Design a protein around this ligand. Structure first.
Ligand SMILES: Nc1ncnc2c1ncn2[C@@H]1O[C@H](COP(=O)(O)OP(=O)(O)OC[C@H]2O[C@@H](O)[C@H](O)[C@@H]2O)[C@@H](O)[C@H]1O
Length: 165
């Protein structure tokens, strides 16, 4: 967990303008967080970038998990292998606001972070799921008490997050 280049937002929340995949390769963290859907079908955001960097090992593992356990609940999580990127991957499902799911479930989603002392993580629901990224950062800051290192790839979004925080 050797995190460098992060801006301190609060006592336990840090942020960097970086690709979460490149951070995982540099830091080799204990836990990397995936912004997942309930079926762990890894799509066009963080999930697909993580999966591609595991040369699809993550998706094969995820498919087997889902065949046994069924879908996650919105706001829920599961711990699977981090493969070559981390010791563990915490797959967390934020609400899909674009499909009408309750934004209030973003609190429950971030509560999953508290089971791990330190995490490399993205802003949940703030991309393909359509939540306000500024709001997602606020919920993270208010909800997570363990040490979270947030990686935000889009510099325009990063600058707006830091400015309004
Ligand atoms: N490689 C990346 N590194 C860092 N941040 C990233 C990266 N790619 C996207 N982001 C940012 O991470 C945040 C989360 O975006 P998404 O990954 O799209 O996550 P979410 O909004 O929760 O959507 C989940 C959905 O997207 C699919 O990838 C996934 O399978 C699920 O269906 C957003 O702020 C987005 O700009």
């Amino acid at each position: 967990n050797s995190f460098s280049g992060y801006l301190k937002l609060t006592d336990n929340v840090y942020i960097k303008n970086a690709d979460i995949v490149e951070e995982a390769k540099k830091v080799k963290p204990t836990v990397v967080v995936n912004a997942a859907n309930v079926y762990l079908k890894h799509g066009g955001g963080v999930a697909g970038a993580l999966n591609k960097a595991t040369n699809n090992a993550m998706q094969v593992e995820s498919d087997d998990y889902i065949a046994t356990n069924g879908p996650l609940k919105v706001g829920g999580s599961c711990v699977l292998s981090g493969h070559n990127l981390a010791k563990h991957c915490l797959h967390v499902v934020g609400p899909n606001v674009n499909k009408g799911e309750d934004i209030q479930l973003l609190k429950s989603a971030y509560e999953n972070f508290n089971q791990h002392e330190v995490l490399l993580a993205p802003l949940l629901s703030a991309g393909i799921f359509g939540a306000d990224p500024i709001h997602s950062l606020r919920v993270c800051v208010d909800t997570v008490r363990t040490n979270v290192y947030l990686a935000v790839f889009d510099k325009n979004l990063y600058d707006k997050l830091v400015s309004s925080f």
